[PDB]
Structure 1
């Protein structure tokens, strides 16, 4: 079982006890709760939590945007898309 101050979680059954009460969570709520509770004290980005809880490669993410920009660059050599590190992209001309 996974234990925190307030939680007793059974990975096998989707069962959650919170401060003694049995709480009904959806499957995705459970996955998010278990992931955080299994990694106490650690900060996860919103992008990372989407990946870890909803899974990889089921739908487009911000990573997909980056990959598509790189593919455009390879197919159109010299394409004037500028990278703003930590933000996004701008086509110059």
Structure 2
């Protein structure tokens, strides 16, 4: 099946892309990103989400890996004074 947008005609089966009438050569990764955005018009994705959805889950460390490792440190070192700064990151107090 094909996916159409204003400018794009994308073939999911063959990885072929037509842009305003012209056939476009994309890398595999470029293609997956283009197709992901083109299949989800009007929706904002964070860079973290796009990394996950396009490059795949669990192939290399991400910002989630960082959060998971902090939680694991907290369990193995009870009372470890790592402060969470909601929506930024972490700080060790003492």
In structure 2, the gaps of 5 or more residues are none
Partner SS for 1:28: helix
Deviations 1:4-47 (A, max 9, x none): 00000000001000000000000000000000000000000000
User: What TM-score, normalized to structure 2?
Assistant: 0.99
Task: State how many pairs are aligned.
Answer: 93
Poorly superposed stretches of 4+, deviation over 6 Å? none
1:57 Cα deviation from its structure 2 partner: 0.2
In structure 1, the gaps of 5 or more residues are none
Q: Using the alignment, how far apart are the partners of 2:52 and 2:16 within structure 1?
A: 22
Aligned CA RMSD, in angstroms, stands at: 0.2
Partner SS for 1:39: coil
Q: Using the alignment, how far apart are the partners of 1:36 and 1:56 within structure 2?
A: 17
1:49 Cα deviation from its structure 2 partner: 0.1
1:88 Cα deviation from its structure 2 partner: 0.2
Q: Using the alignment, how far apart are the partners of 2:29 and 2:71 within structure 1?
A: 31
